[PDB]
Amino acid sequence: MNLTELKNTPVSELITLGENMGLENLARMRKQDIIFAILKQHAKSGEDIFGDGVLEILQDGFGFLRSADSSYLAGPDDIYVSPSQIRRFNLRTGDTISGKIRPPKEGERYFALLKVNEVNFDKPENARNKILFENLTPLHANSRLRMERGNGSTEDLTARVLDLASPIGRGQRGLIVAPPKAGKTMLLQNIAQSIAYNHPDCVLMVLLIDERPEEVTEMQRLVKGEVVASTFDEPASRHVQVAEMVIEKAKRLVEHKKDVIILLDSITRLARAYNTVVPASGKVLTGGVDANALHRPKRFFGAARNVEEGGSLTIIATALIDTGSKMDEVIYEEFKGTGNMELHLSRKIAEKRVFPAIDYNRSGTRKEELLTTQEELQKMWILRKIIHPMGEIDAMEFLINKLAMTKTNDDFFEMMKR
Amino acid sequence: MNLTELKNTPVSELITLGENMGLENLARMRKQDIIFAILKQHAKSGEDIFGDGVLEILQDGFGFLRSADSSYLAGPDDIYVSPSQIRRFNLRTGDTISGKIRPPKEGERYFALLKVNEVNFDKPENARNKILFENLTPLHANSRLRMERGNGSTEDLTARVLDLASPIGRGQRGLIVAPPKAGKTMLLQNIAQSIAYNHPDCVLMVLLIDERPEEVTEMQRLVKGEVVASTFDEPASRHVQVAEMVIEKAKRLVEHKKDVIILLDSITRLARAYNTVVPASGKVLTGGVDANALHRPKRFFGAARNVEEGGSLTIIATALIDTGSKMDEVIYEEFKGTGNMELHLSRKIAEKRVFPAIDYNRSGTRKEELLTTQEELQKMWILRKIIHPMGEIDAMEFLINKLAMTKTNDDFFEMMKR
Ligand SMILES: Nc1ncnc2c1ncn2[C@@H]1O[C@H](COP(=O)(O)OP(=O)(O)O)[C@@H](O)[C@H]1O
Ligand SMILES: Nc1ncnc2c1ncn2[C@@H]1O[C@H](COP(=O)(O)OP(=O)(O)O)[C@@H](O)[C@H]1O
Ligand SMILES: [Mg+2]
Numbered sequence A, B: 001m002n003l004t005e006l007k008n009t010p011v012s013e014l015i016t017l018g019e020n021m022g023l024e025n026l027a028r029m030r031k032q033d034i035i036f037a038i039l040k041q042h043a044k045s046g047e048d049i050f051g052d053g054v055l056e057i058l059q060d061g062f063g064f065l066r067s068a069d070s071s072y073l074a075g076p077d078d079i080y081v082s083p084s085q086i087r088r089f090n091l092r093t094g095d096t097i098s099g100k101i102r103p104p105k106e107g108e109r110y111f112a113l114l115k116v117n118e119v120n121f122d123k124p125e126n127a128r129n130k131i132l133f134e135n136l137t138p139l140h141a142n143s144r145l146r147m148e149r150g151n152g153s154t155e156d157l158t159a160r161v162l163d164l165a166s167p168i169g170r171g172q173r174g175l176i177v178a179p180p181k182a183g184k185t186m187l188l189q190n191i192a193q194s195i196a197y198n199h200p201d202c203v204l205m206v207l208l209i210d211e212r213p214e215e216v217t218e219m220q221r222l223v224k225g226e227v228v229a230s231t232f233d234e235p236a237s238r239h240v241q242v243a244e245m246v247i248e249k250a251k252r253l254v255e256h257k258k259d260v261i262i263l264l265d266s267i268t269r270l271a272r273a274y275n276t277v278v279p280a281s282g283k284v285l286t287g288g289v290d291a292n293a294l295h296r297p298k299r300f301f302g303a304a305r306n307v308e309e310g311g312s313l314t315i316i317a318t319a320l321i322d323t324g325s326k327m328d329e330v331i332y333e334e335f336k337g338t339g340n341m342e343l344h345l346s347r348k349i350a351e352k353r354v355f356p357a358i359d360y361n362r363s364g365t366r367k368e369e370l371l372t373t374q375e376e377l378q379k380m381w382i383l384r385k386i387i388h389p390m391g392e393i394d395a396m397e398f399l400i401n402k403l404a405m406t407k408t409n410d411d412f413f414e415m416m417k418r
């Protein structure tokens, strides 16, 4: 069979298939080992076996084909690719390769690619001449992504508040700032649903760093897209490698005239992982953070842009404030003006149980004239004028009150205008 | 005879039994040595011996059946299991194995397992088909573990405050943050009694790390369950290995659709022990800690989850703050967002002898709507709105005063809803 559907099957069916297929015991070891054993047993028969995965290039030169189901985790069933194939077809880390794999011979442990018949969802002879990501000319965002749903529910209400506070376009560097227990996970979930329903063409890749396992499973079940996460019990190098693989896959996809949206769970956690994994350079700032250590997360965050040739990369990351650890504060301070927009969540609104707890006065994008029309954006300015001279919690309560009895954004605008 | 009942008799009775059996000089030797001598004498008598214990696999390949009465301490009375037996039944560390044992022969110094007839309180055939713990999908806790006894005693007051402050469900990852001499040991004792009374079906395990011997004896006498401890006069390797044994036994129990609960006296002490044991990786964070050193305690804490297939693993661990040590501070900093519920004990409330010294405004759980009913959630919300403005010590004094005048929490809510 094909490795993808074999891996996607739950464990019970895998065990039953292995036990009625010839193997003797599968219940008491990991899913990756069961997959490897089933593949090895089916491979000795001689039937061709297919497989696909994202390419990760090691420092030696050989590469591996990790899978999204296992969250890009190194395992016994990873496909091995020699540098000969990398020379034959120009391949970099993050490329998606699909083809047929060969059984592992003596002296080798992992499977190997027989021949590749898909690179980045098209022919390799057509994909090895594509211009690279950094050579593309960045531009300001000009195509707005609408989170308006129209169903009229509460998630629609918070999506409408999101649209009012800061419009979202393709290729921006959006940043969310939020205290703990302020509702940022639900905000990200609602953004994911809005993106999935409104713009099915865009590629959505939710990335969670240093997350709890239950949150990972809930996000995987809720989101109609690629979700990759690394729980907190895993080492920092695991977080770093997951982030690198995600960003490389996003760059490879955007080089093919595709729109990619990345919903990073915590830029703070990624920065902490990078600081942990980056060797000490002898320079220690406040909170024990090195500038060269912060270079990598800044490089990850700055890849968001709009491509003149085609496609875009919209990175929306979240940051943690007033947690109590100085490292988060210094990360926020060195991440103040990096993004072209910001949205602030208020703890005071959260404890009042008024959701979403968006601080309208402090949140807001810039250069939004390129995103929306003229009259709607003028309505946005006059709403800003109305909201400005009054308290943020009262402003948020007023916004929920005036968005609840109406139905969509333009209806609220015309009701408020008169 | 049976070994696990021989290990539970007092030392004086053991000495009398060995003396009337025909043994000498048993008074001035350790309890394990007396047990081994009595076992050898009764074995050379000719009769059969039954023994049980939790399996621990050594790096060489063979394993030992440790006993929880000695808190899994290596001793002469441990049962040796050969790699052949670990191979015929695929066994992992933490498996509870019960069966007949045989006397040692020449060249070997341990009793050996003869014929295993119980694995994890099940026949050996069925225990081979249990799915590994890592393959199960974690979920949010949705089955409430009610703490209130309802007998009207003052010891129940703490439990009642718990039910108002931070509800606990099956599969929680609770964290208790308390200063020294704030009442965390009595809080854990109250939780253990409430669990043993309200939910007899759950498996209760109390794990004490770096403890004092008198506290160990007190907890063993009080707690109706399994108590294993490693006192402060033992090497860090002992703390580490006791923690691994407990967590592996818990995972093996959970794999059999059992819901188990672990009460960790100090995650800080466990992190200390792991930092001592784990070799350095060249990078040392503030206070003298290593990231890979802290990786294992994070795995221990993150093992807690609610299993979709059935069963759960609740872990409630206490963390130390304001102890004057930077290592504890950094450990708590790295353990902040991991748990899904936190309970804060305040030193100031303890100074004025107000118990339980719970910081109500800081304590709480995540996704508490799953644990409680709708009306109960509304009552908790209005209570939190009432208590929020006032200071922590005033809040707890007022809450205790209000709670002392009722019998159950329903009556308290009805009195508040006047
Ligand atoms: N849009 C919303 N509508 C209703 N409740 C919300 C909303 N956003 C957050 N909450 C509340 O916040 C809690 C979860 O917060 P969460 O999203 O986990 O914040 P964080 O991810 O920052 O910890 C839930 O109990 C929920 O009641
Ligand atoms: N619920 C309670 N009721 C009465 N006294 C308490 C309570 N909890 C703690 N105390 C007092 O606090 C003292 C120390 O508490 P302890 O159990 O030693 O906590 P810790 O282990 O944090 O030091 C005890 O002597 C006890 O008198
Ligand atoms: Mg969250």
Ligand SMILES: [Mg+2]
Pocket: B184, B185
């Ligand atoms: Mg104590």
